[PDB]
Amino acid sequence: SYKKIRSNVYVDVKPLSGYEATTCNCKKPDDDTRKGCVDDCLNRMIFAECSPNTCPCGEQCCNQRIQRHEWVQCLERFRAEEKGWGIRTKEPLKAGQFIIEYLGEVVSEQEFRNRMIEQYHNHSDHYCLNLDSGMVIDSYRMGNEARFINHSCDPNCEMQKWSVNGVYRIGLYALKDMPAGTELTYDYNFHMFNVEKQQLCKCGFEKCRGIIG
Ligand SMILES: C[S@@+](CC[C@H](N)C(=O)[O-])C[C@H]1O[C@@H](n2cnc3c(N)ncnc32)[C@H](O)[C@@H]1O
Ligand SMILES: [Zn+2]
Ligand SMILES: [Zn+2]
Ligand SMILES: [Zn+2]
């Protein structure tokens, strides 16, 4: 239970990326149906999204996925085995594919530490990612479906920090091909803000670490 938000809620923090000037030099394809900025793209290489009114490809550019909230419509919440409630795809997914933005409240470290002590006592789950410079996307109360995605020691998805119009935002990308019905997973230890509490890992993998965080 949470409020669904279409976009992040900025509380007491602004996660400015520091860089702004972005022009591709990767060129428009003549076909309307063929995508513009692919793996060559200068901006994509530094994990920055193109700006629509400056990009050499304009509307052909597929390096604006967060900006344009170009999420996938497969995602389905389901009764996960031992893990509670998880999320899978009804449709096959290819590697490198943008899946969903991770949404929530953007809060400072002290604001989150406050919320942890003041409000998130005797809580069995942990809904938040490190963003930047000790800023946190908290999704305990507000967020999207990306909050139901479980941990794996062997993940098929990955949280990527992007500069979008001067602002850092986190997007979920596939690491491998995934067929219909398969649950989405990522490695928490990377992104999850270090909390004193530890949890047994039920990801069910040969070389499972046995612990989360
Ligand atoms: C961000 S929530 C994920 C959604 C959660 N499954 C639910 O039902 O709301 C993280 C919590 O899910 C559970 N969880 C996620 N991955 C797990 C795993 N690999 N093994 C056991 N529990 C897991 C843990 O209780 C963890 O605190
Ligand atoms: Zn480009
Ligand atoms: Zn572009
Ligand atoms: Zn594991």
Query: Which value in Å is the resolution of this experimental model?
Result: 2.9
Give DSSP secondary structure letters for 69-82.
T---S--EEEEETT
Helix, strand, coil distribution of the chain in percent, nearest 5: 10, 30, 60
Q: How far, in Å, CA of 47 to CA of 57, rounded?
A: 17
The alpha carbon of 186 is separated from its chain's Cα centroid by a whole number of angstroms, namely 10
Q: How far, in Å, CA of 26 to CA of 61, rounded?
A: 10
Q: Would you say 165 and 51 are in contact if contact means Cβ atoms under 8 Å apart?
A: yes
Q: How many CB atoms lie within 10 A of CB 154?
A: 14
The alpha carbon of 56 is separated from its chain's Cα centroid by a whole number of angstroms, namely 27
Query: Which residues are CB-neighbours of 171 under 8 A, at least 6 positions away?
Result: 65, 66, 98, 99, 100, 101, 102, 159, 160, 162
Q: Would you say 115 and 108 are in contact if contact means Cβ atoms under 8 Å apart?
A: no
Q: Which ligand is nearest to the CA of 79?
A: 1
Comparing C-alpha atoms, which of 109, 128, 213, 113 is closest to residue 170? 128
Q: How far, in Å, CA of 181 to CA of 12, rounded?
A: 39
Tokens 């002590």 identify what position?
A: 117
Q: Residue 44: CB within 6 Å of ligand 1?
A: no
Comparing C-alpha atoms, which of 62, 123, 125, 120 is closest to residue 96? 62
Q: Ligand 1 pocket check: which of 125, 149, 154, 172 to mutate, most ligand atoms within 8 Å of Cβ?
A: 125
Q: Where are the domains of the chain?
A: 1-213
CB environment 104-114: b (16+ within 10 A), e (fewer): bbbbeeebbee
Give DSSP secondary structure letters for 40-68.
T-HHHHTTBPPPTTT-TTTTS----TTTT
Give φ, ψ of 2 to 5 degrees.
-175, 160
Q: Tell the CATH superfamily of the 1-213 domain.
A: SET domain (2.170.270.10)
> What method did the depositors use to determine the structure?
X-ray
Ligand 3 centroid vs 192 CA: distance in angstroms?
A: 30
